[model samples]
Target chain A: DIQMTQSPSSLSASVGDRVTITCQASQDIIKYLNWYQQTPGKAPKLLIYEASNLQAGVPSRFSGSGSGTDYTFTISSLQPEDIATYYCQQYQSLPYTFGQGTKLQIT
Target chain B: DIQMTQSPSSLSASVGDRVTITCQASQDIIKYLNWYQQTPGKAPKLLIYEASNLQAGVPSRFSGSGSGTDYTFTISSLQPEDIATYYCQQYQSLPYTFGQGTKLQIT
Candidate 1:
């Protein structure tokens, strides 16, 4: 099983700050990576897929990049509503897996 | 985007009870579906992918079935550890959507 490690389990930032979360896969997974944002008590919403493509209706402020074993999800300028948990998922393996998640909170 | 809707937003069951959660897709997805279980403050774990295929290490009791626009995730017998929210997602479209989720609680 390929393990996914995410950095900075939690972070605090202002609404206008540029925030970034990083994820690393135990092995290469090409570009089969996705990003999701989950609010408390709500289902996760897809933000980006295929590494860099933004999902429909997702804001332009949200972007993703990286391939192979490393990936990143960045928010150009954070918003209060973005105070939630973000996760990265890899679909390259049979049993798809997700990063531990990065919880973003308002400073 | 293919929207996925799940029924019984929440459920309460006793140990050994057979539980089933249903997911409906806004359009035919050809079994390009997956099921995941998420505990509080934790990343979701894949249970079934591509509709009915069980992910490795997932319990046999946790099974998925159905196709096209409808799907189901069932637990033959509930266990304490099974208390979590379950979500069904469809990968047939660009913005892969997830069901609202079904919360299962031990009664």
Candidate 2:
């Protein structure tokens, strides 16, 4: 099984802040990484998939870019509603795995 | 994007009891569905993938089955460690979508 190492388990930022999160895979996963956002007491929503492809209906402020074993998720301008936990997942193999998640707080 | 409608938003069961959760897709998704288990403050873990296939390392007690637009995930015998939220997701289309989720608890 591959492991996903996520950085900055938590973050504190204000609206309009440029926020970024990263996920490093234990092995090469090509462009199979995906990102999701979750709010308290709610199911997670897919924000990006296939590395940098943004999911439809998702805000454009949210973007992703990465290849091989490293990936990044960024909010060009964070919104108040973006205050939620973010996670990165790998679908390159069986037993797909997800990062521990980064909690973003509105400051 | 496909819609995955899950049922019994929440469930409470006793140990050694059989527990089942269901997810119905808005359209035919074949066997492109996956199941995940998530505990508080942690990343979601893959329990079953491609509908009926149990993920490696997952306990045999956990199983999934379905076709077209209907699917089911079941626990043969509930255990204390099984208390967590379960979710179903479909990968048959772009912008993969997940069910609302089913929170499970031990009574």
Per-candidate count of clashing residue pairs (backbone under 3 Å): 0, 0
TM-score of chain B of 2: 0.97
Write one digit per residue (lDDT tens) for candidate 2, span A1-107: 89999988999989899998999999999889989999987878989989998788899998899999989999999887998899999989876999999999989
**Which residue ranges in model 2 land beyond 4 Å of their true spot?**
none
Q: Write the per-residue lDDT of candidate 2 for residues B15-89, one digit (tens) a residue.
A: 999999999998799889999999877899999989988878889999899989899999999988898899999
| Candidate 1 per-residue lDDT over residues A5-83, each given as its tens digit | 9987999999999988999999999889989999999888999988999877888999899979989888999987888
Q: Which portion of correct inter-chain contacts appears in model 1?
A: 0.94
Q: Residue A1 error for model 1, in Å?
A: 1.1
lDDT of 1 by residue, B1-62 (tens): 67778998999999999999999998899989999999877999999988889988989999
- Candidate 2: deviation at residue A2, Å? 0.7
Candidate 1 has a DockQ of: 0.90
TM-score for candidate 1: 0.97
